[PDB]
Design a binder for this molecule. Structure first.
Ligand SMILES: NC(=O)c1ccc[n+]([C@@H]2O[C@H](COP(=O)([O-])OP(=O)(O)OC[C@H]3O[C@@H](n4cnc5c(N)ncnc54)[C@H](O)[C@@H]3O)[C@@H](O)[C@H]2O)c1
Ligand SMILES: NC(=O)c1ccc[n+]([C@@H]2O[C@H](COP(=O)([O-])OP(=O)(O)OC[C@H]3O[C@@H](n4cnc5c(N)ncnc54)[C@H](O)[C@@H]3O)[C@@H](O)[C@H]2O)c1
Ligand SMILES: N=C(N)NCCCCN
Ligand SMILES: N=C(N)NCCCCN
Ligand SMILES: N=C(N)NCCCCN
Ligand SMILES: N=C(N)NCCCCN
Lengths: 474, 474
């Protein structure tokens, strides 16, 4: 039967019961021991309430806000007898404030995004830089500097960000092995960074192709996606953003850096979901991805930074998302950007609506001696239905990563604020792999210069195919 | 009972029997009197042969080429007893050479594109300028200067180019009435051009939204369209191209003009089917179109040019395509450009495969006192099936325009080389209108600056919303 990893000896408070909460709840029930009445779900949606009622779980129909979160969450998280777990799978809530509250009260915490309080983005007073995931991540880094150690809080532990950090580590190990480089895997951050440098990894795409499709065609004036529409649109309207590698010799005129912080990022003064990059996955082969911001674009580049004695970066990989969402989401983006406004309605595809497809999600490491290597999951909707209820393949990659991070947090409960890059990647993948379908590593000789130049003049760098100059669609 | 407009007493030579030839043959049979034995279809494909044989029509299974066209076509065109009609609905053949051959032999001619001989669209030694539709059209204008008058040959008489020239005239008439501009309806080119000028028409989009969709979803690695895939891809890879208005104050850095010719055009050093423009149709409302080259982008701008005594243009409208094809074609373009190569297979949607949808095709005249006015057809697939066989809504708009052009040519058989702008628009619409479904005019207050500026800095011209600077997606 399914492994029960740990007893949770306190309340389990799940904030949000949308596509990911719905997929995560059954895994929590499956893999942890606890009295059923310890778990409570908080979400303002009537749709969510009705579903929770049908699952027989406690439900509080309330939006968590800047004004109520202390009065609501402190009693719930401290109900006893021991340590509770705050599982934050919401939109419109501050990850940082809720994380800090959980830690203050001795509750474990996990989320899948650094989300701000409602109102953050649609404010005309914010400069583009302040709307970046780099800036949001810096709030978490500052929180950790201010309060080192303490109760474990896992930031950004979904599929991507989250699982893909573990895939990067596995991929680096595999690349070394494939070269005949034997000897123990890295143990420390510096050793991981040096492995990437030593292997000559220039950069990393989070290279994803979602091929799920529904039994109904995309409706006019409806945004369709396989996970949060609100979340995807919000991030798609944030600046295009990337971890910025030391090898890069060019950036766009509308690229900007940061005065402060870890030093690993740039952003572009244009929306990520209307920015295309040339990328590749095993099933897609060459494809366009959208350069949507993501926490791990920064966090992986930061993690794999090698510095000199003076503290200047001497090696860092480029890292960013290259997302090809499901076809109906591609059409939804074309519709939304073309109309200059959000659609009147939206829907997230349910497993009962999906006729076939996979969520092919992995990491594409490039620039090393074997050109490019993609490592990741090819989870199909058919396999998903066999192994976990109430979610599609996109959802299961996320919910199983949350499961893995929860196991890690329960196993390592005094680790302070951590990102997926800080966790034991082998333990996490051990927990997650039963939910990932085929997990494979594939080399390719494809580069962004394949077939170029064509019929028109292009500004390309033929000396270094993987330069962002060649990847960015201009 | 369907009107039988005229008897055709000579050979009817149909070159090409793809989507448009298949839709056009039954209209020819319906609306002209002739012995069926006098029709001959020429196409290299087995598929075409089998369909022709099923219709009991003479078929010759040959590709027309530069090497064979004289020896192949002259006996067919001159078989008698009367004047023949060459109906050219092919790809990979020279419209100019066939048209000249038909004229030399006293046969009427019609086509829907200025096509070059096979090999042109991918000659690596061709400069971008030479790949433009402006350049191709100039070969036709030069032919007309060399041999004025004579047997009628109608160049570019499909839906667009073709029908939309007639819609522009009707739209100018309607605008004059609504804006209270007094004067007789124009009856010469110079009078039409002066009317556009007097109305303050800054520019025109050929503004199209195809919403046809099939009973099967888009297959991976298959290009799907509602008319020629080979044709659409070829034109999509030609430079983005537009008739260039005197009101325009800016053009992009990669825009180029022409040192000779009618003077009406610019092109961009990028492919038209990967170039987006902000546009509008009644059903789509605000949408992206692709800036795919089209003969009428140049021909309409040229037709509506007012020159001073010295022969310098003092008024000319901007004119270009803003094409939103069917959703499966949108996905096909994303796939093709994203992969950097044509898909391995393609298909044209048959009426038997299409579940619903329309081809909304009209002209959007902008910059006048009522902002913008769209005039055109909203033909549905359901109506198409009721009124004409063997074609979808896209096809019927084209085949019915060819029919109208044929009627006009028989009624005006010694008019020389003409474009759709040169034909009697009321007569042509009288023939075509039974096949166009709802034909409507709609005003809108939408402009390309709607909702702009937004989240990010943009290079806009706030003084004049309709500037290309604002329309082009950059
Ligand atoms: N790291 C990853 O791989 C990854 C993947 C998917 C989603 N996410 C993120 O996970 C989160 C959930 O995604 P989803 O697909 O379940 O989204 P969803 O849109 O399906 O659900 C969001 C849910 O949060 C709710 N909610 C809104 N305001 C709230 C508030 N004030 N308090 C409590 N709940 C509130 C909605 O009512 C709702 O049911 C999103 O923030 C998201 O961007 C991360
Ligand atoms: N003006 C408009 O509105 C408009 C609209 C649709 C199509 N078109 C144009 O009409 C033409 C036909 O379009 P379609 O949808 O029927 O295309 P299609 O791709 O369906 O058919 C083209 C046909 O030409 C053939 N052919 C190829 N090479 C040939 C040769 N050397 N000699 C004779 N025949 C040959 C194919 O075998 C074929 O059956 C295309 O050139 C096109 O771009 C114009
Ligand atoms: N990383 C993001 N920007 N969003 C989360 C995407 C989840 C789909 N695998
Ligand atoms: N992941 C990093 N960028 N740095 C290491 C942080 C370690 C937190 N305990
Ligand atoms: N005008 C073109 N570039 N192509 C012909 C388009 C036919 C769809 N109405
Ligand atoms: N349509 C033009 N641009 N000029 C007028 C041509 C008239 C051909 N008899």
């Amino acid at each position: 039967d399914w492994p029960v990893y740990h007893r949770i000896d306190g309340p389990i408070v799940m904030i949000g019961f949308g596509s990911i909460g719905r997929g995560t709840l059954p895994l929590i029930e499956r893999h942890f021991a606890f009295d059923r009445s310890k778990l409570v779900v908080i979400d303002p949606s009537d749709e969510a309430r009705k579903l929770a009622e049908a699952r027989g779980v406690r439900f509080i129909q309330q939006a968590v806000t800047r004004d109520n979160y202390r009065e609501l969450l402190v009693p719930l998280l401290t109900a006893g007898p021991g340590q509770g777990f705050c599982v934050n799978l919401s939109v419109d809530t501050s990850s940082l404030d809720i994380m800090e509250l959980a830690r203050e009260n001795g509750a474990l915490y996990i989320d899948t995004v650094v989300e701000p309080w409602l109102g953050f983005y649609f404010d005309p007073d914010l400069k583009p830089e302040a709307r970046s995931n780099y800036a949001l991540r810096e709030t978490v880094l500052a929180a950790r500097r201010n309060k080192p150690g303490g109760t474990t809080a896992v930031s950004c532990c979904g599929a991507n960000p989250g699982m893909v950090s573990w895939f990067v580590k596995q991929a680096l190990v595999n690349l070394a092995a494939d070269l005949g480089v034997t000897g123990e895997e890295p143990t420390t951050r510096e050793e991981w960074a040096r492995l990437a440098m030593d292997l000559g990894v220039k950069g990393i795409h989070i290279a994803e192709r979602d091929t799920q499709r529904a039994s109904f065609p995309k409706p006019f004036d409806v945004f369709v996606n396989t996970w949060s529409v609100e979340g995807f649109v919000s991030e798609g309207l944030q600046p295009a953003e990337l971890g910025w590698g030391t090898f890069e010799r060019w950036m766009p005129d509308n690229a900007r850096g940061h005065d402060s912080g870890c030093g690993a990022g740039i952003y572009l003064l244009q929306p990520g979901a209307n920015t295309r990059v040339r990328s590749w996955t095993p099933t897609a082969m060459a494809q366009y991805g959208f350069l949507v911001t993501s926490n791990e674009s920064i966090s992986i580049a930061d993690f794999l930074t090698v510095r000199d004695a003076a503290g200047q970066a001497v090696y860092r990989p480029t890292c960013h998302y290259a997302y090809h969402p499901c076809n109906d989401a591609v059409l939804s983006l074309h519709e939304m950007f073309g109309s200059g406004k959000r659609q009147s309605d939206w829907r997230i595809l349910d497993e009962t609506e999906i006729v076939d497809g996979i969520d092919e999600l992995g990491v594409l490491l490039y620039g090393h001696g074997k050109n490019a290597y993609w490592y990741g999951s090819q989870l199909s909707i058919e396999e998903t239905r066999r192994i976990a209820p109430d979610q599609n393949a996109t959802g299961l990659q996320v919910s199983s990563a949350v499961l893995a991070g929860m196991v890690w947090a329960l196993e390592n409960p005094n680790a302070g604020i951590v990102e997926a890059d800080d966790l034991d990647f082998r333990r996490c993948l051990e927990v997650q792999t039963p939910y990932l379908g085929p997990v494979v590593g594939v080399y390719t000789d494809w580069t962004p210069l394949a077939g170029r130049p064509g019929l028109f003049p292009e500004d390309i760098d033929t000396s270094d195919p993987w330069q962002f100059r060649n990847v960015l669609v201009r």
